[PDB]
Structure formats: C-alpha cells, structure tokens
Design a protein around this ligand. Sequence first.
Ligand SMILES: Nc1ncnc2c1ncn2[C@@H]1O[C@H](COP(=O)(O)OP(=O)(O)OP(O)(O)=S)[C@@H](O)[C@H]1O
Ligand SMILES: Nc1ncnc2c1ncn2[C@@H]1O[C@H](COP(=O)(O)OP(=O)(O)OP(O)(O)=S)[C@@H](O)[C@H]1O
Lengths: 352, 352
Amino acid sequence: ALPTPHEIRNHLDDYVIGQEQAKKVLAVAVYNHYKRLRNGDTSNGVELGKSNILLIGPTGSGKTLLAETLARLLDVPFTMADATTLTEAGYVGEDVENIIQKLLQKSDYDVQKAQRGIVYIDQIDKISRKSDNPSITRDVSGEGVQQALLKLIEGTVAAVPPQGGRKHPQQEFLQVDTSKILFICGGAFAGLDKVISHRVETGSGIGFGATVKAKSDKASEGELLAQVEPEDLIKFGLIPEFIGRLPVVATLNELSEEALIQILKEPKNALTKQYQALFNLEGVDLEFRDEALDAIAKKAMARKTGARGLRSIVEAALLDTMYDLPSMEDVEKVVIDESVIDGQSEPLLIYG
Amino acid sequence: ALPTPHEIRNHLDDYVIGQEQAKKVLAVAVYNHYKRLRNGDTSNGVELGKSNILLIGPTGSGKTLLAETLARLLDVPFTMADATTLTEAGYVGEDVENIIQKLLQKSDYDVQKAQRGIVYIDQIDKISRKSDNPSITRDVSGEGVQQALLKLIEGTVAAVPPQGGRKHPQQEFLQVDTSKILFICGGAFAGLDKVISHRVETGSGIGFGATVKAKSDKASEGELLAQVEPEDLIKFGLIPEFIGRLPVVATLNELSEEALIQILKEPKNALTKQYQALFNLEGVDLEFRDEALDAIAKKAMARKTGARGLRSIVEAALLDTMYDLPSMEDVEKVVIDESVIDGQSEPLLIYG
Ligand SMILES: Nc1ncnc2c1ncn2[C@@H]1O[C@H](COP(=O)(O)OP(=O)(O)OP(O)(O)=S)[C@@H](O)[C@H]1O
Ligand SMILES: Nc1ncnc2c1ncn2[C@@H]1O[C@H](COP(=O)(O)OP(=O)(O)OP(O)(O)=S)[C@@H](O)[C@H]1O
C-alpha cells in the first residue's frame, strides 16, 4: 500500500521540529499526488485538478530543509532549483526550461517517469516586481520569470535537448508534459509584515480619535503572516495571474525559545551531534548540559536570523578550545558550562 | 452537414458558464471558417476576407479553458502556443516559425490539412510596450515580436524544416501559406482598467461641481472593459499595425457570486466532482450542501483572483479531514457545513 499522512509526517518529524501546519500541507499533497498519478483518467471522474504549494516563513525556519528531507523518502523524482538565475526567454542568464532538464538527469531521461515527478523552487521573493519602478524598463529577472512560469504551472510541453546533443546533426528536442507535475515554491518574503499592517491596523492616526500603537512591539510575525491573503502579495509585486496558479499557502511560524532547545537534541542531524561526531573521530567525547542550551536560545533570537544563526554562538565559544585541543594530549572528555557561553569562564577539560 | 452556432455552443456550455458574449464570437468564427473552408479558393466573392479574434478578460475568467474545449470538438487541427518564448531575429530563445512547425505535429506534416488549422496564443500582453513612446532599447520580447507577427497574420510563406531533418545534407524547408490560417491571440491585460478610466472619467476635480469617485468599488473591471477601443491599447503599448490585424474583440466579464456556485456543480470538471472522485477510490463519499457554497463564493471574490483561486478555500478546510482520513477507519461519508468553511466548526463524519 501507499504511505499515509501520519507515517510521512512521522518521518519528517525526525528531521524537522516545530512546524505543525507546514508538515500537514506537504503530506496531503504528496499523499494525493500518488492518487492522481495512479489513476490517470481511469475512474468515473475526469479532468483531475492540481494544487501547488507556496511556502512562506522567516529565515532559518525550515523551508529549504523540508524539500531536502522529502527527497529522501520520496520515490518519484525530485529536484531543487532556483529562481534567481532565470531570465525572460532569450537573455544571457538562463531559460525556464532548464528546470525540466535537471529533472531528467535524476530520472535517467525517463519521460514517462519525469512527468510524474515533483519540483521545488527556492527564493521566489527575488523575482518580485518593484511596485514603483520606472515605467520605461523591462524587469527580465522578476516580471519576465513570473510571466514565463504561468503556462508551466498550468501545463504545457517544452523542448528539452536530450543530453545536450553530440553536434548540430541531431537538432531535435523532446516534449515533456507538465500538467501533472507538482510545484512547491518557497521564499522568505522581506517587508511583507509592513504591508499587512497597513491593511489590518488601518490606524497610524496622529489625531485624538485614532488609536495610537499601544507598544513598539506589535503585529507578531507568526500571527501576522497567518492573516495573509492574495491581495497582500499584489502590493508586494507578484501578479494575480501567477498567484492563482498556487492556491495553497503555508505560513511558517518563527522559532520559539523552547523549539531551539529541541532542535539541538531531538533531530539526528543536530549541531550538537555534528560537533559530537567531529570530536568522536578525534578520540574525544563531548557534553552539552541543558543549563547551556536554554542560554543559547536567548542569544540566537537576539540575532533575529533564525536557526542558521546558531553556529555563530557555538563556534565563537568553541573557537578557543578547538584551536588548542589537537596540540593537547591525554584529554578524553570535554565539559561545557553555562558560564562558558557567557564568556566569563573557560570550559573544563577532563584528562585521561 | 456541419455544426451550428447553437449546437457548438451547447458543447461549450457543459464546460463553461457565464460567458455568453465570448461564446458567440468563437462560434461565428469557427462556423465561418468551415464555410470559408468549404470553398476551395473559389467563390463568387473572390479573395474572401479573414477576421482574427482578440480575447480580453480578467484573470481566471476562462480564456484558456475555451481553447482546450474547442480542440476536442474541433475537427481541423488546433495548437496551444504561448508568446512567452518568442524572440525576433533568430535569437536563442525561439522564433515565430516554431508555431507553424508545432502545428504540423498535430497534422502529421499535411500542408493542405494544416493551412485550414486554427491557432491560439496566450499571454499576448507580455510582448507589449510599457509606454506610447516607440522604444529606448532593442526590446526583443516586446514590440519586436509584434513586428514579426504582422506579416504572419496578413499572409506569407515561412520556411519550416520538415521533421527537423536527419542531418545537414537535406538543408531544405517547406513553404506554408498563412493568409487562410486563423489566429486567436488573447491574454489577461494588467493595468488596462486605469488607462481606460483616464479616458472616460474625464478627470477628478477637487471642487464641488466635479464628480468624485463615489465609492472605492466603482467602474468594475467588466463594465469598464466593455468600453474598450483600439486607441486605448495604443497607450498600453501595442502598435496599431498589430491591432489592425485583430479587428474583432471579445470582452469577458468577471465571475459573479451565483456564477461560482454553478461552476462547482454543473461543469463536468468541477472541483466538487474532482474531490468526490478523489474519495471515491478510497471507498468514501462526499457531500457539499448549498449553504456551504454561498459562503465559499463570497470568499473567492475577496481574493480577487477568480475561479483559479477557489482551491485555496476548499483545500484549507479539507486539509484537516484529508490528513486523518486514511488513518481513520470505518468512515464512509463526510458532510461539510457552512461553519466548516469559516473554521469555527469541524466537518461532521459518518461511521459505518
Ligand atoms: N524546524 C527545524 N528543525 C531543525 N533544524 C531546523 C529547523 N528549521 C531550520 N533548521 C536549521 O536551519 C537550517 C537551514 O534551514 P532552511 O530551511 O534553509 O531555512 P530557510 O527558511 O529555507 O532559509 P531561506 O529559505 O534561504 S531564507 C537547517 O539546515 C537546520 O540546521
Ligand atoms: N466559466 C468558467 N466555468 C468553469 N470554470 C472556469 C470558468 N472560467 C475559469 N474556470 C476555471 O479556471 C481554470 C483556468 O481558467 P483559464 O481559461 O485559465 O482562465 P484564463 O482566462 O485563461 O486566465 P489566464 O489568462 O490564464 S491568467 C479552469 O481550468 C477552470 O477550473
């Protein structure tokens, strides 16, 4: 039998933590993709639709991580492309058809197996139209890319040189349908919080009757993105014709103080396990007490960079120890204290 | 015997609703095409004239749907091209002649059967200029594409490599007339409403006598587009020469509230029938009461995206059900209430 949403979600939970609603969206799409793939116009119903996904969230929230972990468990082909390196059908940078070419490399040029594949795009915000730009210009990077992707997300056939061709002799191209291919676009949008505030609060009134902002901190990013709608993205720069192709939307909440503590212990590829393996080959053990982990959470959130801004807190601390650890000998275990993170103390070394 | 406008329309009515004005235009065109085709280049009126079509409508109004349904009932060959990949002067992206060679794939390289074919182009607004000025730089994906299409829509013979050729020795091309070929170039224009508003509004004086904008919602997109003329498209960026080749114009209206309710039940490919088939294979039925659909219609128009942005509403509510439905057993029927769409309530489930 095929997988289940609870089973596929249980697998992603091993590699991803603190994203409940986001994992549900991907499970239903993947679980539903196998159904549409298994019965293509072989049931009472016909003209089976499609529902792409648009992932939105802050930096270091786990958007790019879900696509990578999904490829491990996914059977059908999967790719991880980008939108920054695309041009508008003819310029020197790149064409949209390169995405389909990368899919065939993993599918071994199996057209029947490539149409049933999944596609992922990262950094979609980088192709967002600048709301007030000079009218006499052409946005090949941002407007052109969206315009080109319109027919792709809907379904069409695109010429793809198989293997690049030996020489001019062949001069042929392969047709690859895209009506059944899924697309998972995602990218951290910048400045979107400001747009929703103008529409939602509708205040900022210096007068008496108008209600002034109670505090400096308001409109929580996690709670603000939840109130997103397609009309908000139009003011951002995206075209409604493009967003209509991606009905589903997923709002990822930012990291929490308790979530960061679990990311270092529960996952298998956590940074603590990475450094533990870094010293394991060196014949040296490692320790990370909970009294130090909770302290690191406050340091990371202050950076406002996300989970990816955590190595700066760890490597800045262990820089001194790693520098002189190889020269030192007869050292078996290392102990990390809360004070070391603060920088007022030196980590203890266990001789042996 | 040939089809009729009433007979051909009835077939489109099964797949399209609320587009009576646009349906009559395509019926007369295809009907006149057969009569124009019945005469083997000889009639009382020598050199019969041609009349192309320019479909204009909002986003997700049903333009691409008509071209797809038309090819099913149409006997003569049909193609579904796009103006996104075209580049003039033989650039690396694509050439205009690709449309012709693509048409032969459907006709199996039959010139006499291909000259009587129909052509459809989407995203025609993508190749329009930004201002009335001629240009400031070489606009490959723009006015240059229109200049190349001028000769093609009037009539000429374009070189076409038959089958691509085995190698360089063939070095020949086939000539294919285009004076008799029909062309349906239509795409949702963006920002056209404001351009037309300046022409008909007559300005907005700040004094008493002048007429100010009554409400925020005034001069709807559909009512406004009906007042479109060729001179308005010149300020948009299209050249009058290209517009002269497209005398006919079809103004599609925006989807209404009651129109969306009919689209979910009457059409064969409606979303209600799609999800009904999605659960039919799972041995589970589905229901959608009328009280739930009226609320969904109000939510879709709020998104300002059309019917294509309807899946976002249905997928949000169903998400919870689809996630735990496979794990759940002894479940045969699901009922969706109006409250479920709002999110206050949970969809009722039936066990047995
Ligand atoms: N939920 C999570 N659980 C564990 N680690 C996480 C989680 N979210 C992020 N990380 C860490 O953050 C790293 C990168 O996360 P990403 O998915 O790249 O964030 P991102 O939002 O995709 O970055 P962008 O899209 O380029 S702004 C991962 O390799 C993990 O180390
Ligand atoms: N009149 C209609 N009746 C039923 N479904 C419709 C109708 N119009 C649009 N739809 C739905 O919208 C989908 C896409 O319609 P399209 O033909 O792509 O609209 P559109 O005018 O082409 O929008 P663009 O130009 O591609 S942005 C169809 O597959 C239907 O599901």
